[PDB]
């Protein structure tokens, strides 16, 4: 017919290249439902994510644009691989959906947290996140939204990061949730939490909303420094400064031996170093928090360190693009469209 065709997966219509068969729903990442599919040409499992009229709204479009450009221009063993993009509508007039085809991993970290890792796994996984993160950063991209749902792993122990349709609940760094102003290590809090979660084997802060975290968080790490409170908005300083005050617990009492696996044959892969790294990462005040390089140089992580993994040449953006403008509906559509057509 016209290369495309249509299946109903529940209430959603996927329209895709005939080469993509046997679609199964596998989940929904921020801005789109995603199908697993068999790719008849490559002879390979793939993943198809659909963004239905992504130009709909200011929010949506900003993110979809970011995601598009980024997914093109960024390439690395620890960042989900792009394989194909398309719309099945044959004109800018008639264009409404975008389809991004990616590699299919086995699972999201949700997931690894659940099971009982040895140290070389915990470390290696973490090393892989950090390396992927260093890559994004080396081109001034800051993810701001790293969490287990948006990080995927394979049953050969590789890990890749999904998502920049947010990149530029309590996994987000405080500097971020407190409208505070941020920097690259805003992504290191994310990792600190995730590692913390890997060790504990479940949720780190048994806390519901995007400020019921806060209390469970401060309850445990302890109320942040006075001369960090300044840095806050008077709007916000009031709220924080008003909360009860907590001493916190040591990292030994928060992450005690019993929770870690046996100290490995290897020198540096020990609960005392893991605890060390963690306590340098899971810090509330960003200017007191370790950077990605330091985390990479840290005895727990550096055992895998590989200059050719970690020091790849940055992606290069046009910096013409860096969402430095808001737009109207029409323009976005055109932009996305240009961008998608550019990707065919």
């Amino acid at each position: 017919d016209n290369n495309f065709y249509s299946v109903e997966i529940g209430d959603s219509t996927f329209t895709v290249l005939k080469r993509y068969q046997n679609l199964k729903p596998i989940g929904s990442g921020a801005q789109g439902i995603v199908c697993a599919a068999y790719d008849a040409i490559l002879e390979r499992n793939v993943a198809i994510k659909k963004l239905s009229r992504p130009f709909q709204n200011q929010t949506h479009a900003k993110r979809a644009y970011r995601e598009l450009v980024l997914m093109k221009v960024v390439n690395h063993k620890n960042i989900i691989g792009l394989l194909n993009v398309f719309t099945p509508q044959k004109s800018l007039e008639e264009f409404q959906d975008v389809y991004i085809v990616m590699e299919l991993m086995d699972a999201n970290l949700s997931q690894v947290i659940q099971m009982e890792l040895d140290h070389e796994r915990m470390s290696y996984l973490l090393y892989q996140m950090l390396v992927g993160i260093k890559h994004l950063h080396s081109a001034g991209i800051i993810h701001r939204d790293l969490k287990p749902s948006n990080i995927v792993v394979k049953s050969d122990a590789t890990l890749k990061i999904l998502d920049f349709g947010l990149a530029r609940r309590y996994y987000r760094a405080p500097e971020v949730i407190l409208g505070m102003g941020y920097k690259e290590n805003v992504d290191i809090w994310s990792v600190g939490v995730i590692m913390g979660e890997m060790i504990k084997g479940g949720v780190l802060f048994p806390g519901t909303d995007h400020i019921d975290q806060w209390n469970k968080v401060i309850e445990q790490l302890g109320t942040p420094s006075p001369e960090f409170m300044k840095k806050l908005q008077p709007t916000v300083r009031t709220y924080v400064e008003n909360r009860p005050k907590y001493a916190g617990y040591s990292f030994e009492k928060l992450f005690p031996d019993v929770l870690f696996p046996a100290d490995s044959e290897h020198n540096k892969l020990k609960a005392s170093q893991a605890r060390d790294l963690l306590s340098k990462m899971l810090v509330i005040d960003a200017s007191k928090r370790i950077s990605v390089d330091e985390a990479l140089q840290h005895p727990y992580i550096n055992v895998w360190y590989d200059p050719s993994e970690a020091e790849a040449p940055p992606p290069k953006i046009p910096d013409k693009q860096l969402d430095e403008r808001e737009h109207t509906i029409e323009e976005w559509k055109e932009l996305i469209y240009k961008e998608v057509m550019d990707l065919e």
């Binding site: 086995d106 699972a107 997931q111 690894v112 099971m115 070389e120 796994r121 290696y124 792993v153 394979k154 049953s155 050969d156 122990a157 290897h266 892969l269 055992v303 895998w304």
Partner: peptide, 10 residues
């Protein structure tokens, strides 16, 4: 210190 190559997704 060798890189793991398996990971059990049970």
């Amino acid at each position: 210190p060798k890189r793991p190559t398996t990971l059990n997704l049970f």
